[PDB]
Amino acid sequence: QMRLPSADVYRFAEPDSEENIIFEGIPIIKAGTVIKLIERLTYHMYADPNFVRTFLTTYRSFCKPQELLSLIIERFEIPEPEPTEADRIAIENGDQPLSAELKRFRKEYIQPVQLRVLNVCRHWVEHHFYDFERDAYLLQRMEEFIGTVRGKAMKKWVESITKIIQRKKIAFQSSPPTVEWHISRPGHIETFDLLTLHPIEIARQLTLLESDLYRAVQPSELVGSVWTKEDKEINSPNLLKMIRHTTNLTLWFEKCIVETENLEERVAVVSRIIEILQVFQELNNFNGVLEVVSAMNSSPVYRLDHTFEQIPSRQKKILEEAHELSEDHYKKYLAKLRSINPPCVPFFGIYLTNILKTEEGNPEVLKRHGKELINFSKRRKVAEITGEIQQYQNQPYCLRVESDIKRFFENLNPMGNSMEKEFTDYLFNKSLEIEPRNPKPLPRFPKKYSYPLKSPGVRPSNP
């Protein structure tokens, strides 16, 4: 083969050994030092698409962005062998032509490695620009590096990378159905509520909202269970925003239910929420369907036997059928998802559960002769889970946004100023009040709504 740089001048020349890289054409990396991982992330022998994508999605769980950039730049700066004093003089004179060995080295090692590095930089800014958005110094270094790279073969890469960075920094194929209105009138946000807005529109606007929340979540926000750790707000902003939306919506449904003390009005409320679930299902917004199921199964709501006994049989069946989605480890849901095409808002809860388990259930590193190697197979397993999330992030819903309804829901704050525990306890105590435990009979309560409770139904007013 050909002689690579000396270890005392280039760190990525160290031959592979059982102590620096472990494998599972193109072998699969199981573990290794950051150095070897980076070496293979830009291997000169061949391209490694799957490793590049997996590495860029999960590296933060084992290497800082600043250090990664330093490492790939260090990788890029390949030194050439130093000449002797005899060779130096031989060059001043016209003694010999350019070393065929050096020519080969430049062509077979340096150029290919350098191109691999630029390919990583390209994928980095294209799929994970948020690293540079969150760290200005990082963006400066990258731009400085790319901005000084010079070479005929690399010009095209510099151009491409530069274009992506620029556009990142600055930053209906069909007629949608007519917006539906019920009691509340357009523009009159003061009357907006669960029973006053049209159930169809509540479902549509929530689907649009949830679709956007979903599409913004990046896989790296789940890697290393970072959304549950100290720097969660920085590493998982999009994921938290969606989780919080879900918590708030579920709590809002529960709230609407238990605060409606009159039995007939509460039955009306539950029935309307189920109608909303019907439209969520209609739009393939499983996230929404399950938020409803979650509310119905909550401590304060599930125990309201007199309320569920009073809802229409047809809706009891509709709720039962949807409830089956989560049953037995989401067996029915997972099967249903496999044959679904977008637009769709998948249930996210499952991804979080699986990752938490995979993250806790696997070792951060792998011991070899006492040396800690990064367990890359673990990262590949997590990437397998997150890779599924991106499936429905590219197709928008053909539904028109209603800015006022959208705002109403973006601002939902069921808990008011009270805290989590305090509110959850309040809801359960409200449940016990409207439907007391066994011995005590069901007390009657006065109506709280002054408008009709009759639902307009979930069939769009197309005519």
mmCIF file with all atom_site columns, C-alpha atoms in Angstrom, residues 19-170:
data_model
loop_
_atom_site.group_PDB
_atom_site.id
_atom_site.type_symbol
_atom_site.label_atom_id
_atom_site.label_alt_id
_atom_site.label_comp_id
_atom_site.label_asym_id
_atom_site.label_entity_id
_atom_site.label_seq_id
_atom_site.pdbx_PDB_ins_code
_atom_site.Cartn_x
_atom_site.Cartn_y
_atom_site.Cartn_z
_atom_site.occupancy
_atom_site.B_iso_or_equiv
_atom_site.pdbx_formal_charge
_atom_site.auth_seq_id
_atom_site.auth_comp_id
_atom_site.auth_asym_id
_atom_site.auth_atom_id
_atom_site.pdbx_PDB_model_num
ATOM 1   C CA . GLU A 1 19  ? -7.819  -1.402 21.392  1.00 0.00 ? 19  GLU A CA 1
ATOM 2   C CA . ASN A 1 20  ? -9.059  1.486  19.254  1.00 0.00 ? 20  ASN A CA 1
ATOM 3   C CA . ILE A 1 21  ? -11.750 0.148  16.908  1.00 0.00 ? 21  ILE A CA 1
ATOM 4   C CA . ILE A 1 22  ? -14.121 -2.816 17.000  1.00 0.00 ? 22  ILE A CA 1
ATOM 5   C CA . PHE A 1 23  ? -16.274 -3.981 14.103  1.00 0.00 ? 23  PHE A CA 1
ATOM 6   C CA . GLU A 1 24  ? -19.643 -5.731 14.290  1.00 0.00 ? 24  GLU A CA 1
ATOM 7   C CA . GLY A 1 25  ? -18.389 -4.673 1.568   1.00 0.00 ? 25  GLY A CA 1
ATOM 8   C CA . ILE A 1 26  ? -17.994 -1.902 4.150   1.00 0.00 ? 26  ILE A CA 1
ATOM 9   C CA . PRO A 1 27  ? -17.655 -3.203 7.731   1.00 0.00 ? 27  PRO A CA 1
ATOM 10  C CA . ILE A 1 28  ? -19.910 -2.037 10.555  1.00 0.00 ? 28  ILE A CA 1
ATOM 11  C CA . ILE A 1 29  ? -18.313 -0.073 13.383  1.00 0.00 ? 29  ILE A CA 1
ATOM 12  C CA . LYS A 1 30  ? -19.280 -1.380 16.816  1.00 0.00 ? 30  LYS A CA 1
ATOM 13  C CA . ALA A 1 31  ? -16.998 0.771  18.941  1.00 0.00 ? 31  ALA A CA 1
ATOM 14  C CA . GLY A 1 32  ? -13.848 2.848  18.903  1.00 0.00 ? 32  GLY A CA 1
ATOM 15  C CA . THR A 1 33  ? -12.103 5.998  20.081  1.00 0.00 ? 33  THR A CA 1
ATOM 16  C CA . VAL A 1 34  ? -13.418 9.371  18.854  1.00 0.00 ? 34  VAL A CA 1
ATOM 17  C CA . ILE A 1 35  ? -10.245 9.593  16.740  1.00 0.00 ? 35  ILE A CA 1
ATOM 18  C CA . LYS A 1 36  ? -10.892 6.330  14.899  1.00 0.00 ? 36  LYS A CA 1
ATOM 19  C CA . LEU A 1 37  ? -14.604 7.122  14.579  1.00 0.00 ? 37  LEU A CA 1
ATOM 20  C CA . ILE A 1 38  ? -13.686 10.401 12.878  1.00 0.00 ? 38  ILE A CA 1
ATOM 21  C CA . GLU A 1 39  ? -11.018 8.635  10.833  1.00 0.00 ? 39  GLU A CA 1
ATOM 22  C CA . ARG A 1 40  ? -13.692 6.286  9.478   1.00 0.00 ? 40  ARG A CA 1
ATOM 23  C CA . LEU A 1 41  ? -16.220 9.137  9.217   1.00 0.00 ? 41  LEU A CA 1
ATOM 24  C CA . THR A 1 42  ? -13.851 10.368 6.502   1.00 0.00 ? 42  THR A CA 1
ATOM 25  C CA . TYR A 1 43  ? -12.177 7.132  5.385   1.00 0.00 ? 43  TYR A CA 1
ATOM 26  C CA . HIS A 1 44  ? -10.261 7.536  2.122   1.00 0.00 ? 44  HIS A CA 1
ATOM 27  C CA . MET A 1 45  ? -10.889 4.039  0.748   1.00 0.00 ? 45  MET A CA 1
ATOM 28  C CA . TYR A 1 46  ? -14.631 4.533  0.243   1.00 0.00 ? 46  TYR A CA 1
ATOM 29  C CA . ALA A 1 47  ? -17.727 6.579  1.093   1.00 0.00 ? 47  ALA A CA 1
ATOM 30  C CA . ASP A 1 48  ? -19.869 5.645  4.104   1.00 0.00 ? 48  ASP A CA 1
ATOM 31  C CA . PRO A 1 49  ? -23.311 7.342  3.797   1.00 0.00 ? 49  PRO A CA 1
ATOM 32  C CA . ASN A 1 50  ? -25.006 5.436  6.594   1.00 0.00 ? 50  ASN A CA 1
ATOM 33  C CA . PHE A 1 51  ? -22.160 6.025  9.036   1.00 0.00 ? 51  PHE A CA 1
ATOM 34  C CA . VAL A 1 52  ? -22.005 9.740  8.199   1.00 0.00 ? 52  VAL A CA 1
ATOM 35  C CA . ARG A 1 53  ? -25.751 10.197 8.709   1.00 0.00 ? 53  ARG A CA 1
ATOM 36  C CA . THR A 1 54  ? -25.813 8.133  11.906  1.00 0.00 ? 54  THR A CA 1
ATOM 37  C CA . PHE A 1 55  ? -22.713 9.872  13.290  1.00 0.00 ? 55  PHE A CA 1
ATOM 38  C CA . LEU A 1 56  ? -24.066 13.385 12.645  1.00 0.00 ? 56  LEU A CA 1
ATOM 39  C CA . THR A 1 57  ? -27.378 12.481 14.260  1.00 0.00 ? 57  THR A CA 1
ATOM 40  C CA . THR A 1 58  ? -25.840 11.007 17.427  1.00 0.00 ? 58  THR A CA 1
ATOM 41  C CA . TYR A 1 59  ? -22.318 12.412 17.985  1.00 0.00 ? 59  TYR A CA 1
ATOM 42  C CA . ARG A 1 60  ? -23.409 15.012 20.578  1.00 0.00 ? 60  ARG A CA 1
ATOM 43  C CA . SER A 1 61  ? -23.958 12.130 22.992  1.00 0.00 ? 61  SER A CA 1
ATOM 44  C CA . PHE A 1 62  ? -20.183 11.550 22.967  1.00 0.00 ? 62  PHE A CA 1
ATOM 45  C CA . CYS A 1 63  ? -18.453 14.600 21.469  1.00 0.00 ? 63  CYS A CA 1
ATOM 46  C CA . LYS A 1 64  ? -18.999 18.366 21.613  1.00 0.00 ? 64  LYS A CA 1
ATOM 47  C CA . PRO A 1 65  ? -19.728 20.322 18.401  1.00 0.00 ? 65  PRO A CA 1
ATOM 48  C CA . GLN A 1 66  ? -16.654 22.536 18.972  1.00 0.00 ? 66  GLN A CA 1
ATOM 49  C CA . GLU A 1 67  ? -14.461 19.466 19.392  1.00 0.00 ? 67  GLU A CA 1
ATOM 50  C CA . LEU A 1 68  ? -15.975 17.764 16.329  1.00 0.00 ? 68  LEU A CA 1
ATOM 51  C CA . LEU A 1 69  ? -15.131 20.753 14.134  1.00 0.00 ? 69  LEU A CA 1
ATOM 52  C CA . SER A 1 70  ? -11.589 20.842 15.542  1.00 0.00 ? 70  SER A CA 1
ATOM 53  C CA . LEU A 1 71  ? -11.209 17.141 14.810  1.00 0.00 ? 71  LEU A CA 1
ATOM 54  C CA . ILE A 1 72  ? -12.393 17.220 11.190  1.00 0.00 ? 72  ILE A CA 1
ATOM 55  C CA . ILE A 1 73  ? -10.245 20.285 10.465  1.00 0.00 ? 73  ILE A CA 1
ATOM 56  C CA . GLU A 1 74  ? -7.300  18.507 12.063  1.00 0.00 ? 74  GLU A CA 1
ATOM 57  C CA . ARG A 1 75  ? -8.235  15.559 9.844   1.00 0.00 ? 75  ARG A CA 1
ATOM 58  C CA . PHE A 1 76  ? -8.203  17.841 6.803   1.00 0.00 ? 76  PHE A CA 1
ATOM 59  C CA . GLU A 1 77  ? -4.717  19.282 7.455   1.00 0.00 ? 77  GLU A CA 1
ATOM 60  C CA . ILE A 1 78  ? -2.668  16.333 6.234   1.00 0.00 ? 78  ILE A CA 1
ATOM 61  C CA . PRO A 1 79  ? 1.093   16.996 6.358   1.00 0.00 ? 79  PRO A CA 1
ATOM 62  C CA . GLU A 1 80  ? 3.549   15.638 3.800   1.00 0.00 ? 80  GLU A CA 1
ATOM 63  C CA . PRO A 1 81  ? 6.842   13.891 4.685   1.00 0.00 ? 81  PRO A CA 1
ATOM 64  C CA . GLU A 1 82  ? 9.800   16.157 5.466   1.00 0.00 ? 82  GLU A CA 1
ATOM 65  C CA . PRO A 1 83  ? 12.738  16.023 3.015   1.00 0.00 ? 83  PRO A CA 1
ATOM 66  C CA . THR A 1 84  ? 16.315  15.278 4.074   1.00 0.00 ? 84  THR A CA 1
ATOM 67  C CA . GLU A 1 85  ? 19.036  17.883 3.582   1.00 0.00 ? 85  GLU A CA 1
ATOM 68  C CA . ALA A 1 86  ? 20.204  16.019 0.473   1.00 0.00 ? 86  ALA A CA 1
ATOM 69  C CA . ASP A 1 87  ? 16.709  16.028 -1.017  1.00 0.00 ? 87  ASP A CA 1
ATOM 70  C CA . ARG A 1 88  ? 16.179  19.712 -0.199  1.00 0.00 ? 88  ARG A CA 1
ATOM 71  C CA . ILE A 1 89  ? 19.298  20.677 -2.154  1.00 0.00 ? 89  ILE A CA 1
ATOM 72  C CA . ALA A 1 90  ? 18.375  18.241 -4.923  1.00 0.00 ? 90  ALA A CA 1
ATOM 73  C CA . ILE A 1 91  ? 15.178  20.282 -5.299  1.00 0.00 ? 91  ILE A CA 1
ATOM 74  C CA . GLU A 1 92  ? 16.913  23.672 -5.461  1.00 0.00 ? 92  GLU A CA 1
ATOM 75  C CA . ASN A 1 93  ? 18.869  22.226 -8.371  1.00 0.00 ? 93  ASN A CA 1
ATOM 76  C CA . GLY A 1 94  ? 16.989  20.504 -11.183 1.00 0.00 ? 94  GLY A CA 1
ATOM 77  C CA . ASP A 1 95  ? 18.202  17.080 -10.079 1.00 0.00 ? 95  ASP A CA 1
ATOM 78  C CA . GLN A 1 96  ? 14.988  15.063 -9.989  1.00 0.00 ? 96  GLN A CA 1
ATOM 79  C CA . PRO A 1 97  ? 11.315  15.392 -10.980 1.00 0.00 ? 97  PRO A CA 1
ATOM 80  C CA . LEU A 1 98  ? 8.411   15.414 -8.521  1.00 0.00 ? 98  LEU A CA 1
ATOM 81  C CA . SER A 1 99  ? 8.374   12.223 -6.426  1.00 0.00 ? 99  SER A CA 1
ATOM 82  C CA . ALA A 1 100 ? 5.912   9.699  -7.858  1.00 0.00 ? 100 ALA A CA 1
ATOM 83  C CA . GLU A 1 101 ? 5.314   8.654  -4.239  1.00 0.00 ? 101 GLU A CA 1
ATOM 84  C CA . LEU A 1 102 ? 4.225   12.137 -3.212  1.00 0.00 ? 102 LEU A CA 1
ATOM 85  C CA . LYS A 1 103 ? 2.013   12.468 -6.290  1.00 0.00 ? 103 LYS A CA 1
ATOM 86  C CA . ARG A 1 104 ? 0.299   9.212  -5.361  1.00 0.00 ? 104 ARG A CA 1
ATOM 87  C CA . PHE A 1 105 ? -0.008  10.247 -1.708  1.00 0.00 ? 105 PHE A CA 1
ATOM 88  C CA . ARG A 1 106 ? -1.699  13.500 -2.718  1.00 0.00 ? 106 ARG A CA 1
ATOM 89  C CA . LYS A 1 107 ? -3.990  11.746 -5.202  1.00 0.00 ? 107 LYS A CA 1
ATOM 90  C CA . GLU A 1 108 ? -4.789  8.557  -3.273  1.00 0.00 ? 108 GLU A CA 1
ATOM 91  C CA . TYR A 1 109 ? -4.869  9.841  0.306   1.00 0.00 ? 109 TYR A CA 1
ATOM 92  C CA . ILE A 1 110 ? -4.929  13.607 0.821   1.00 0.00 ? 110 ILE A CA 1
ATOM 93  C CA . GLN A 1 111 ? -7.456  14.569 -1.866  1.00 0.00 ? 111 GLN A CA 1
ATOM 94  C CA . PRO A 1 112 ? -9.877  11.769 -1.023  1.00 0.00 ? 112 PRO A CA 1
ATOM 95  C CA . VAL A 1 113 ? -9.686  12.491 2.718   1.00 0.00 ? 113 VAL A CA 1
ATOM 96  C CA . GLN A 1 114 ? -10.129 16.236 2.224   1.00 0.00 ? 114 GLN A CA 1
ATOM 97  C CA . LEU A 1 115 ? -13.147 15.635 0.001   1.00 0.00 ? 115 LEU A CA 1
ATOM 98  C CA . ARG A 1 116 ? -14.651 13.324 2.641   1.00 0.00 ? 116 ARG A CA 1
ATOM 99  C CA . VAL A 1 117 ? -14.238 16.038 5.274   1.00 0.00 ? 117 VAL A CA 1
ATOM 100 C CA . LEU A 1 118 ? -16.029 18.575 3.088   1.00 0.00 ? 118 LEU A CA 1
ATOM 101 C CA . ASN A 1 119 ? -18.806 16.035 2.509   1.00 0.00 ? 119 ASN A CA 1
ATOM 102 C CA . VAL A 1 120 ? -19.248 15.824 6.293   1.00 0.00 ? 120 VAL A CA 1
ATOM 103 C CA . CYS A 1 121 ? -19.241 19.627 6.618   1.00 0.00 ? 121 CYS A CA 1
ATOM 104 C CA . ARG A 1 122 ? -21.902 19.709 3.895   1.00 0.00 ? 122 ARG A CA 1
ATOM 105 C CA . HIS A 1 123 ? -24.139 17.165 5.607   1.00 0.00 ? 123 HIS A CA 1
ATOM 106 C CA . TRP A 1 124 ? -23.526 18.949 8.910   1.00 0.00 ? 124 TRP A CA 1
ATOM 107 C CA . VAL A 1 125 ? -24.855 22.352 7.818   1.00 0.00 ? 125 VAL A CA 1
ATOM 108 C CA . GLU A 1 126 ? -27.589 20.828 5.667   1.00 0.00 ? 126 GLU A CA 1
ATOM 109 C CA . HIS A 1 127 ? -29.145 18.479 8.205   1.00 0.00 ? 127 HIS A CA 1
ATOM 110 C CA . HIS A 1 128 ? -27.989 19.937 11.537  1.00 0.00 ? 128 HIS A CA 1
ATOM 111 C CA . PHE A 1 129 ? -27.625 23.683 11.107  1.00 0.00 ? 129 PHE A CA 1
ATOM 112 C CA . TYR A 1 130 ? -29.112 24.127 14.573  1.00 0.00 ? 130 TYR A CA 1
ATOM 113 C CA . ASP A 1 131 ? -25.646 23.388 16.026  1.00 0.00 ? 131 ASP A CA 1
ATOM 114 C CA . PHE A 1 132 ? -24.380 26.598 14.380  1.00 0.00 ? 132 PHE A CA 1
ATOM 115 C CA . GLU A 1 133 ? -27.552 28.522 15.193  1.00 0.00 ? 133 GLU A CA 1
ATOM 116 C CA . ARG A 1 134 ? -27.024 27.724 18.880  1.00 0.00 ? 134 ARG A CA 1
ATOM 117 C CA . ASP A 1 135 ? -23.296 28.518 18.921  1.00 0.00 ? 135 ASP A CA 1
ATOM 118 C CA . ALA A 1 136 ? -22.097 31.627 17.059  1.00 0.00 ? 136 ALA A CA 1
ATOM 119 C CA . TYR A 1 137 ? -18.405 30.865 17.586  1.00 0.00 ? 137 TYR A CA 1
ATOM 120 C CA . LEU A 1 138 ? -18.975 27.472 15.922  1.00 0.00 ? 138 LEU A CA 1
ATOM 121 C CA . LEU A 1 139 ? -20.554 29.124 12.887  1.00 0.00 ? 139 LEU A CA 1
ATOM 122 C CA . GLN A 1 140 ? -17.632 31.578 12.716  1.00 0.00 ? 140 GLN A CA 1
ATOM 123 C CA . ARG A 1 141 ? -15.067 28.785 12.767  1.00 0.00 ? 141 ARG A CA 1
ATOM 124 C CA . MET A 1 142 ? -16.928 26.781 10.094  1.00 0.00 ? 142 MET A CA 1
ATOM 125 C CA . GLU A 1 143 ? -17.343 29.762 7.787   1.00 0.00 ? 143 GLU A CA 1
ATOM 126 C CA . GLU A 1 144 ? -13.679 30.665 8.363   1.00 0.00 ? 144 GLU A CA 1
ATOM 127 C CA . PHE A 1 145 ? -12.574 27.136 7.561   1.00 0.00 ? 145 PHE A CA 1
ATOM 128 C CA . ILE A 1 146 ? -14.746 26.703 4.449   1.00 0.00 ? 146 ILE A CA 1
ATOM 129 C CA . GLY A 1 147 ? -13.894 30.255 3.426   1.00 0.00 ? 147 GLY A CA 1
ATOM 130 C CA . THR A 1 148 ? -10.181 29.484 3.239   1.00 0.00 ? 148 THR A CA 1
ATOM 131 C CA . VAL A 1 149 ? -10.233 26.051 1.588   1.00 0.00 ? 149 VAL A CA 1
ATOM 132 C CA . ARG A 1 150 ? -8.484  26.189 -1.780  1.00 0.00 ? 150 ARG A CA 1
ATOM 133 C CA . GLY A 1 151 ? -8.227  23.585 -4.543  1.00 0.00 ? 151 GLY A CA 1
ATOM 134 C CA . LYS A 1 152 ? -9.648  22.790 -7.978  1.00 0.00 ? 152 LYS A CA 1
ATOM 135 C CA . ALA A 1 153 ? -11.307 19.570 -6.805  1.00 0.00 ? 153 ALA A CA 1
ATOM 136 C CA . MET A 1 154 ? -12.737 21.170 -3.670  1.00 0.00 ? 154 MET A CA 1
ATOM 137 C CA . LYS A 1 155 ? -14.112 24.353 -5.251  1.00 0.00 ? 155 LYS A CA 1
ATOM 138 C CA . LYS A 1 156 ? -17.474 22.737 -5.997  1.00 0.00 ? 156 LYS A CA 1
ATOM 139 C CA . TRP A 1 157 ? -17.820 21.651 -2.366  1.00 0.00 ? 157 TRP A CA 1
ATOM 140 C CA . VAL A 1 158 ? -16.908 25.082 -1.007  1.00 0.00 ? 158 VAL A CA 1
ATOM 141 C CA . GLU A 1 159 ? -19.526 26.573 -3.341  1.00 0.00 ? 159 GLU A CA 1
ATOM 142 C CA . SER A 1 160 ? -22.231 24.129 -2.231  1.00 0.00 ? 160 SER A CA 1
ATOM 143 C CA . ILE A 1 161 ? -21.462 24.417 1.475   1.00 0.00 ? 161 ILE A CA 1
ATOM 144 C CA . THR A 1 162 ? -21.351 28.205 1.234   1.00 0.00 ? 162 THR A CA 1
ATOM 145 C CA . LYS A 1 163 ? -24.754 28.345 -0.455  1.00 0.00 ? 163 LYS A CA 1
ATOM 146 C CA . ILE A 1 164 ? -26.354 26.180 2.220   1.00 0.00 ? 164 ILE A CA 1
ATOM 147 C CA . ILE A 1 165 ? -24.887 28.272 5.019   1.00 0.00 ? 165 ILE A CA 1
ATOM 148 C CA . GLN A 1 166 ? -26.175 31.496 3.437   1.00 0.00 ? 166 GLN A CA 1
ATOM 149 C CA . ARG A 1 167 ? -29.757 30.317 3.023   1.00 0.00 ? 167 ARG A CA 1
ATOM 150 C CA . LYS A 1 168 ? -29.709 28.852 6.553   1.00 0.00 ? 168 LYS A CA 1
ATOM 151 C CA . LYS A 1 169 ? -28.548 32.162 8.048   1.00 0.00 ? 169 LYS A CA 1
ATOM 152 C CA . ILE A 1 170 ? -31.214 34.308 6.372   1.00 0.00 ? 170 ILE A CA 1
#
